[PDB]
Each structure stands twice: as structure tokens, then as C-alpha cells.
């Protein structure tokens, strides 16, 4: 689980969206996992506008930061899941890092900021979401 809050917005992973956040919706894309819902309260994040591959994650599963290298936003192929049938996931950096079933949700940040959320993993890999391409999220 977890989230990023953002001025007037929160963004989460779409396969996580409560009722709350299908109700105060801005945006969803399916092809990136991600949903964002409108907030009344003023957010703690900022959004890194930047094209870093080094930055350090957080994994709820291990209670700790850990650095990674990632790639640069792309089309991967991901299994069918419970949530979504298989196809290719928009947007997403891959990395060589421990994630399992509850991770998602979990921040990735850089230097100048939030990079984006985990949304995949296994077998000694971790992917995030990018939100770095979300400019309207700054106003
Ligand atoms: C950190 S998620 C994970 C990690 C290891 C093993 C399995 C998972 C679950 C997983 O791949 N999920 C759950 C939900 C997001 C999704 C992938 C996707 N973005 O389409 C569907
Ligand atoms: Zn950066």
C-alpha cells in the first residue's frame, strides 16, 4: 500500500483505488495502473521533473530504503493477474530489487523529488509506475 500526496491531489495504484477515490476521480489510465482522486487537504509530496535512473525505494515488505538503477519509462509485457488480464503496462521502470504482494504503492524517489510508485515485481525484480510525465500534478 501507499500513496502520494500532491496539492490538491492523491495518487495511488488504480488496482488499490477505494470507493473514496472512484468517487473524487481526476484520472485513471489502466495501462499504467494508476488513478488519481482529488483531496480537500493540501498534500506533503513534490514530484521530481527529471530523467535520474538512480534513485531509493522504499519496501513495505522488508521495512526498509533500499538504492536501485532503473530504466527509463517503457511498454513491459505483465502477466494476467486477478486485476487486470495479461498485456503491456505503459510507463514503467524495471529494477533489480525485492518486491512481493503487498509492495505496491511504495515510493520511488530521486534527488529532485517523487519518481513514482511500485506496481510489479518478482523473481529479484521491482517496476514503478512513472509519474514523472504528470505535469498538470504541479497545478
Ligand atoms: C509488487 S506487485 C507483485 C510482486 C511480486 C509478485 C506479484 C506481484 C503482484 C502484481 O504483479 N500485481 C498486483 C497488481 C499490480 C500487479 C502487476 C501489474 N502492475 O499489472 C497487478
Ligand atoms: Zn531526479
Same mark, same amino acid.
Not at 477505494?18 to 484520472?27: E, F, K, P, R
Not at 503496462?89 to 533489480?96: D, E, G, N, P, Y
Not at 504528470?134 to 497545478?139: H, I, T
Given at each position: ?7 490538491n491531489y492523491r495518487?495511488v !495504484? $488504480? *488496482?488499490?483505488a477505494?470507493? !473514496? @477515490? /472512484?468517487?473524487?476521480?481526476? /484520472?485513471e489510465? %489502466? %495501462?499504467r495502473?494508476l488513478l ?9 509530496d ?6 535520474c535512473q ?5 519496501? %513495505?515488505? $522488508? $521495512?526498509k *530504503?533500499?538504492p536501485?538503477?532503473? +530504466?527509463? &519509462? ?7 493477474s486477478?486485476?487486470? &488480464?495479461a498485456?503491456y503496462? +505503459? *510507463? ?5 530489487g525485492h %518486491?512481493? &504482494?503487498? @509492495? ?7 534527488q *529532485?523529488?517523487v ?7 518478482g !523473481?529479484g525484480?521491482?517496476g514503478?509506475? @512513472?509519474?514523472?510525465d504528470?505535469? /498538470?500534478?504541479?497545478?
Open positions: 500500500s501507499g500513496a502520494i500526496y500532491v496539492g495518487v !495504484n $488504480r *488496482h488499490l477505494t470507493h !473514496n @477515490d /472512484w468517487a473524487n476521480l481526476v /484520472w489510465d %489502466s %495501462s495502473d488519481v482522486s482529488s483531496t480537500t487537504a493540501q498534500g506533503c513534490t514530484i521530481a521533473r527529471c530523467d538512480t534513485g531509493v525505494y522504499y519496501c %513495505s515488505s $522488508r $521495512r *530504503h533500499y536501485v538503477s532503473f +530504466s527509463k &519509462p517503457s511498454l513491459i509485457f505483465v502477466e494476467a486477478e486485476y487486470y &488480464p498485456r503496462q +505503459s *510507463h514503467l521502470m524495471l529494477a533489480v %518486491s512481493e &504482494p503487498g @509492495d505496491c504503492g511504495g515510493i520511488l524517489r530521486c *529532485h523529488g519518481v513514482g510508485i511500485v506496481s510489479t515485481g !523473481n525484480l521491482v514503478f509506475a @512513472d509519474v514523472r504528470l505535469l /498538470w500534478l504541479d497545478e
